[PDB]
Write a protein that binds this ligand. Structure first.
Ligand code: CA
Ligand code: CA
Ligand code: CA
Ligand code: CA
Lengths: 93, 93
């Protein structure tokens, strides 16, 4: 099946849906990623309600203080945090 | 939309489709991950043709030499490698 493959194609499409909407299509930005999580992962990855949560999240990515992200840094950080949350409910049954 | 959200639900379902098929449903294994990539990401992440490629890939994950993976280690390693490949074709246009 393409279920797992479809997983890579989908995050890449929404990624180019908002990332290229700001014009900076060659680099991601702090506001661009804010839209992607609050759009489909708002309930899981809290972010829209805690705007401070997005400043902290980009800080690990923008460790360079570039206020911009290379998108690759983003996938590794949120990938581990959300995956851990699913096991959190399963751990207590 | 749930396109990005659907991305997390799909890799998690196939993950529990083969991971729980070996009985070791509490921990992933070297053969379990081999099936997930060769099943839907065979063409992108070469693996089935280069069985040596799977030994090397788990080595970074099983840096502990446990021949077993915590699944979380897996998502971060293959997440960055496949994402980079998509930009490889885009970089040369
Ligand atoms: Ca962008
Ligand atoms: Ca950055
Ligand atoms: Ca398993
Ligand atoms: Ca491991």
């Amino acid at each position: 099946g393409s279920e797992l493959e479809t997983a890579m194609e989908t995050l890449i499409n929404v990624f180019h849906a908002h990332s290229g909407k700001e014009g900076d299509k060659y680099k991601l930005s702090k506001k661009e990623l804010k839209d992607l999580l609050q759009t489909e992962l708002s309930s899981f990855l809290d972010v829209q309600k805690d705007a401070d949560a997005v400043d902290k999240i980009m800080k690990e990515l923008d460790e360079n203080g570039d206020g911009e992200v290379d998108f690759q840094e983003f996938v590794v950080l949120v990938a581990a945090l959300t995956v851990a949350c699913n096991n959190f409910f399963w751990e207590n049954s």
